């Protein structure tokens, strides 16, 4: 459908108690896959939501990022598109842009999220490793930062 609907769902999630919604994650993912030429708008809207969201909501924003990045990656494989040489207006472009904001969103969640949410981000690294979503060097950096943040 569109970016206006996507931003409207993010607005509703911002006002929710937990920021975690399986139904909203699926709706947001469909809107981004139905509008791939506008992937810069959808990726930028997730970045803006994650950064402004309450501290309790950073994990839910990472679940949105997770679903969207893996869906662009699936689309790219289907269309024989490379992550190393992405088509900006197509699935590989979206996969590349979502990768570009991942470090910032994980770092922001490390700084603000309740400590209980931090092992849940380690679980995303495992999902990404299994799906080969991000290069191992990126995943090692994220894992190291999360392990450091979990204190002891």
Numbering used by the authors: 2 to 153
Give passages from the manuscript.
In contrast to this widely accepted paradigm, we demonstrate that the fission yeast CID-RRM protein Seb1 drives transcription termination of both types of Pol II transcribed genes. Using a multidisciplinary approach, our study demonstrates that conserved CID-RRM proteins play a key role in 3′ end formation of Pol II transcripts.
Thus, we crystallized the Seb1-CID1–152 and compared the structure with other CID structures in complex with CTD peptides to determine whether interacting aa are topologically conserved. The highest affinity was observed to S2P, followed by S5P, S7P and unphosphorylated peptide. Also, several aa make phosphate-independent contacts with the CTD. When these two residues are mutated to Ala, binding to S2P-CTD can still be observed (lanes 7 and 9) suggesting that both aa may contribute to the S2P interaction. Indeed, Y64K reduces binding to all phosphorylated and unphosphorylated peptides; however, it has a stronger effect on S2P than S5P interaction (lane 4 and Fig. 2g–i).
